[PDB]
Amino acid sequence: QIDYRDVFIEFLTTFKGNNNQNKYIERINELVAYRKKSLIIEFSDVLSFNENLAYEIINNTKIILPILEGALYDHILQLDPTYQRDIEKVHVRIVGIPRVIELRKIRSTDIGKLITIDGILVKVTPVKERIYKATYKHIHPDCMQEFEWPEDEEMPEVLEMPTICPKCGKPGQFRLIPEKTKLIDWQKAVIQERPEEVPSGQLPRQLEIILEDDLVDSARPGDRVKVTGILDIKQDSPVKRGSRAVFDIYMKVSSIEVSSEEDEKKIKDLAKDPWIRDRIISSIAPSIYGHWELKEALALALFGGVPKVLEDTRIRGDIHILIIGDPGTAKSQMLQFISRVAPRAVYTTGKGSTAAGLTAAVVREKGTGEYYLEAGALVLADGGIAVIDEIDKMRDEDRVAIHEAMEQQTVSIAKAGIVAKLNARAAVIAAGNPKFGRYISERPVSDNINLPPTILSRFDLIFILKDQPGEQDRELANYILDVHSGKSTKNIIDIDTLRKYIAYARKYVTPKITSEAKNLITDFFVEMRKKSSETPDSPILITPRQLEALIRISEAYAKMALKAEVTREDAERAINIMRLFLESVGVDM
């Protein structure tokens, strides 16, 4: 038995990272300045430094984590005594455990060991408080004594009350003292296994996890997470007998990750290429041949515009795309790709969705009997992208429920005495088929689309796809067979890098409109409106929304190159893509 306090302190103060910058030393300095009370340590770094120390953490976790925490606290306290009286104790969280076990393959032998499970977050409860050291008071005409009930031991998960007063050795009834009671933050969350690991013909399983102290509110529902902790059995109602000697299992989370400097460096050099826009466009759905104009439209929606928030109103900065095409034009294929490359996306279908499920659902809690709100698909997609396949297959009474969310980006509910307004800032991508399955060229556009003009005006771009056999069949057939043969197109940015690029652009880039782009947009909008009045029979209308669309598209093109201003070149591209949308719908320019 050798003390690990010196080794742990030596590891923190002597470890050299990629640049030999003493990364953990910097983390301590950040911890002291911000009073973060939590430290994150990569497991592979510990193993590289001292393999014996890594072994002890994995197995002897129950009786070595407090030892390291105490040593770390003294080092921080010595570094800055002001840190004391503000933070009582610090936490050491280990990340990178080699022991990873699937949610469905958890057995009895894994209880009591530090393991890692990767899944999808589903439900998060409001933050509550847990008593870990009580303070009772034996009220009895002779006692008038208070005491901390659990002596030399943390309070168990089961609320237990003293039977014999330690101060007088007598029974009676005791009264809790909230003022002297010590509390710790407590949150309950539910994790679900990923859809790619569920066995065939079976519903996904669920596991209950517990977050405490600073770990509360570390993630939102729908996030992909990696949790490391100790499994344990759950006790709910042990007071009443009746067998039920079978218990569920829950998880005590010690460290949690969601979904770096090197990545930012990789992204920065990518935008240096003048043809970065073409590379991004060609990297959208590499398995689909052609449809270049469609690929550009989907790329713009991934980046989006710049939302504007003023003192009196706000203007949305999301781009909505609608695709109408004959069956077999692969429309669902790009939509599936978009839901996989976007940092945050939700995939829905017209037939399998309802008005309540898309925006918000009011459900009665059977435990208390009072109504409460449940987030819909659009609410869960706030700040992301919502995909609605088969938009024409849903009832018009249900489709009309998203008119407010698509423009005002808010959901208003007045039901069961509940008045609320939830943000739904999400970009909507929709696809569907014409009225008669396939497009009828002889018939006009009004009866082919079979959609009200109100929802049509809310879409920035509308593309009509027609499957016309011709001279391009041979090249299309060769491309499809090459995909089935395993051949892949090179010079394509991978999904993981592309997803990182999109997230960085949406966070640190905010283009501004210049004077040159202002004149070009104004001239085109005025000219576009004049031609619209010539033929008023078209279902589509040129409303002031289309003017907003040009600004959003112009910003999206600039954001793709990580530019700071909307130059003249970006304005031309916005006009060019708008011309194709107008030409496809039947309006010449």
Partner DNA sequence: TTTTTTTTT
> Is 326 annotated to bind ligand?
yes
Say whether residue 258 binds a copy of itself (CB under 8 A).
no
Half-sphere exposure of 426 (CA within 13 A, CB side): 32
CB 335 within 8 A of CB 387: yes
Cα 474 versus chain centre, distance: 42
Site for a copy of itself in 272-331 (CB under 8 A): 285-287, 308, 310-313, 315, 326-330
> Which are the contacts of 129, defined by CB distance < 8 A and separation ≥ 6?
183, 184, 185, 186
Backbone angles phi, psi at 360, to 5 degrees: -170, 145
Q: Which of 25, 64, 276, 361 binds a copy of itself (CB under 8 A)?
A: 361
**Residue 67 binding: pick among a copy of itself, Mg ion, Zn ion, none (C-beta 5-8 Å cut-off by kind):** none
Compute the least distance from the CB of residue 410 to a copy of itself, in Å.
Answer: 8
> Is 181 annotated to bind ligand?
no
Say whether residue 162 binds DNA (CB under 7 A).
no
Q: Draw the binding track, 331-360, toward DNA (x: CB under 7 A; -: no contact).
A: -----------------------xxxx--x
CB 343 within 8 A of CB 503: yes
> Is 328 annotated to bind ligand?
yes
Task: Considering only the stretches 24-32, 55-63, 123-131, 325-333, report the one whose residues sit in contact with Mg ion under the rule CB under 5 A.
Answer: 325-333
> Is 325 annotated to bind ligand?
yes
For 197-216, give the DSSP string.
GSPTT-PPPEEEEEEEGGGT
Report the alpha-carbon distance of residue 566 to residue 126 in Å, rounded: 43
Residue with tokens 């004149």, as numbered in its chain: 519
How many residues of this chain interact with Mg ion, rule: CB under 5 A? 2
Say whether residue 485 binds a copy of itself (CB under 8 A).
yes
> Which among 181, 174, 173, 178 is positioned nearest to 155, based on CA atoms?
181
Say whether residue 168 binds a copy of itself (CB under 8 A).
no
How many residues of this chain interact with a copy of itself, rule: CB under 8 A? 186
Which residue, 362 or 503, has its beta carbon nearer to DNA?
362
**Residue 168 binding: pick among Zn ion, Mg ion, DNA, none (C-beta 5-8 Å cut-off by kind):** Zn ion
Site for Zn ion in 124-153 (CB under 5 A): 138, 143
CB 139 within 8 A of CB 173: yes
**The pair of three-digit structure tokens given for residue 157, joined into one six-digit string:** 């998960």
Compute the least distance from the CB of residue 266 to a copy of itself, in Å.
Answer: 18
Cα-only R_g, the chain: 30
CB 427 within 8 A of CB 297: no
Residue with tokens 């002779």, as numbered in its chain: 142
Report the alpha-carbon distance of residue 378 to residue 406 in Å, rounded: 9
Report the alpha-carbon distance of residue 229 to residue 116 in Å, rounded: 7
Q: Which of 65, 131, 168, 483 binds Zn ion (CB under 5 A)?
A: 168
How many residues of this chain interact with DNA, rule: CB under 7 A? 12
> Is 554 annotated to bind ligand?
no
Compute the least distance from the CB of residue 8 to a copy of itself, in Å.
Answer: 25
Report the alpha-carbon distance of residue 256 to residue 253 in Å, rounded: 7
Report the alpha-carbon distance of residue 284 to residue 292 in Å, rounded: 10
Say whether residue 332 binds Mg ion (CB under 5 A).
yes
516 burial (CB, 10 Å; 0-12 / 13-18 / 19+) is: middle
Compute the least distance from the CB of residue 359 to DNA, in Å.
Answer: 8
**The pair of three-digit structure tokens given for residue 376, joined into one six-digit string:** 């819909």
> Is 427 annotated to bind ligand?
no
> Is 332 annotated to bind ligand?
yes
Which residue, 175 or 265, has its beta carbon nearer to a copy of itself?
175
| Residue ranges in 459-567 assigned as alpha helix (H) | 473-484, 495-508, 515-534, 544-560
Site for a copy of itself in 449-478 (CB under 8 A): 452-454, 457, 467-469, 473-474, 476-478
Which residue, 316 or 331, has its beta carbon nearer to Mg ion?
331
Site for DNA in 356-395 (CB under 7 A): 356-357, 360-364, 371
| Residue ranges in 443-514 assigned as alpha helix (H) | 445-449, 453-457, 473-484, 495-508
Task: Considering only the stretches 161-169, 205-213, 235-243, 524-532, report the one whose residues sit in contact with Zn ion under the rule CB under 5 A.
Answer: 161-169
State the CB neighbour count (10 A cutoff) for residue 218: 19
Which residue, 55 or 371, has its beta carbon nearer to DNA?
371
Q: Which of 1, 20, 78, 200 binds a copy of itself (CB under 8 A)?
A: 200
3-state secondary structure of 24: helix
Report the alpha-carbon distance of residue 381 to residue 378 in Å, rounded: 5
Which residue, 360 or 431, has its beta carbon nearer to Mg ion?
431
Report the alpha-carbon distance of residue 374 to residue 110 in Å, rounded: 35
Which residue, 29 or 332, has its beta carbon nearer to Mg ion?
332
Q: Draw the binding track, 311-350, toward Zn ion (x: CB under 5 A; -: no contact).
A: ----------------------------------------
Which residue, 109 or 368, has its beta carbon nearer to DNA?
368
Task: Considering only the stretches 195-203, 286-294, 330-338, 441-449, report the one whose residues sit in contact with Mg ion under the rule CB under 5 A.
Answer: 330-338
Report the alpha-carbon distance of residue 324 to residue 320 in Å, rounded: 14
> Is 119 annotated to bind ligand?
no
Q: Which of 35, 252, 530, 568 binds a copy of itself (CB under 8 A)?
A: 530
| Contacting positions for Zn ion (CB under 5 A) | 138, 143, 165, 167-168
| Binding residue ranges for ATP | 325-332
| Contacting positions for DNA (CB under 7 A) | 354-357, 360-364, 371, 415-416
